[PDB]
From a paper:
As a large family of membrane proteins crucial for bacterial physiology and virulence, the Multiple Peptide Resistance Factors (MprFs) utilize two separate domains to synthesize and translocate aminoacyl phospholipids to the outer leaflets of bacterial membranes. The function of MprFs enables Staphylococcus aureus and other pathogenic bacteria to acquire resistance to daptomycin and cationic antimicrobial peptides. Here we present cryo-electron microscopy structures of MprF homodimer from Rhizobium tropici (RtMprF) at two different states in complex with lysyl-phosphatidylglycerol (LysPG). RtMprF contains a membrane-embedded lipid-flippase domain with two deep cavities opening toward the inner and outer leaflets of the membrane respectively.
The crystal structure of the catalytic domain of RtMprF in the C-terminal region has been solved at 2.0 Å resolution, and serves as the initial model for building the corresponding region in the cryo-EM structures of the full-length RtMprF. The synthase domain of RtMprF (Pro539-Gly860) superposes well with those of PaMprF and BlMprF (root-mean-square deviation of α-carbons at 0.977 and 1.297 Å, respectively). They share similar tandem repeats of the General Control Nonderepressible 5 (a histone acetyltransferase of a transcriptional regulatory complex) related N-acetyltransferase (GNAT) folds (GNAT folds 1 and 2). The potential binding site of lysyl-tRNA in the synthase domain of RtMprF is located at the cleft between GNAT folds 1 and 2, according to the previous studies on an alanyl transferase FemX involved in peptidoglycan biosynthesis (in complex with an aminoacyl-tRNA analog) and BlMprF in complex with L-lysine amide (LYN).
Numbering used by the authors: 542 to 793, 805 to 871
The structure:
Amino acid sequence: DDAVARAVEIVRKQGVADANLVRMGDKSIMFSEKGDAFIMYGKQGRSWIALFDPVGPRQALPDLIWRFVETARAAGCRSVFYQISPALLSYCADAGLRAFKLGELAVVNLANFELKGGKWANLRQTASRAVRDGLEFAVIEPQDIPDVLDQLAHVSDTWLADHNAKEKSFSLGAFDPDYVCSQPVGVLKKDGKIVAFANILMTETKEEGSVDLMRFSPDAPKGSMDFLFVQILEYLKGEGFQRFNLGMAPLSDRVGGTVFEHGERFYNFKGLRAFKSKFHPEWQPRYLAVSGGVSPMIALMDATFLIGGGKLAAALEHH
């Protein structure tokens, strides 16, 4: 009785790459009546928190959203939609939810991207140095990931240790073998070993691609992150994709400050905004929507606890 595998079937058929986060298995799933759309969500504090836009055909969305919001209310909890797109603002408002800007998503139009055409000098130069340093890129399909799982784990473990970092959840994936083997990975190799990898989040519609995990061993040279992103970008472009999402960046007032702190905590694991700006991306806003007139502060703190695994040790270091 695997709700997750059923949700994956819906993911494959739509265009939102980040809906693949359902594959982590740590989110509950609520299906539409016809079974053609779903909301994946978590529970934290007195909140039910949906992750991203509801997934599936737009026609299923108003009843599905309403079911989610009413089910949370019946359980004594507020309802939250975490990191929704502009196209969901009207649907969420029609269910009584107010939206607040969370940050912006960096999106690369793959048709126009031309590494050597003149508009991306910094990335072109960095990619040259990467090749000269001996870095090679490959995409590894799921069934071929077990054979390198020891190398991926080496990269992941040393990355976490290097950054004194702990695994997150909900909106961010973690090095869980079932999840890691479920989607293709892009890897960098040097001197015969993998020194970096990212999972490549795709769908069958070839609209949008993204990455979730992205990690580097101490043997990854400087510029490895730039090169891995460019290499995955070109792979997706070559496979016919329209867009490559590089991830969220923090918001460019107690409300706005809490929003900024939340983004600083969670949006800077695979390059800062300045790194994303090297791709001259389109910046698309994303939102937190909350029921009941509650201030976005409460919902965002619940999301912070939820992504941190139910824990929050301290404020971030700031001067």
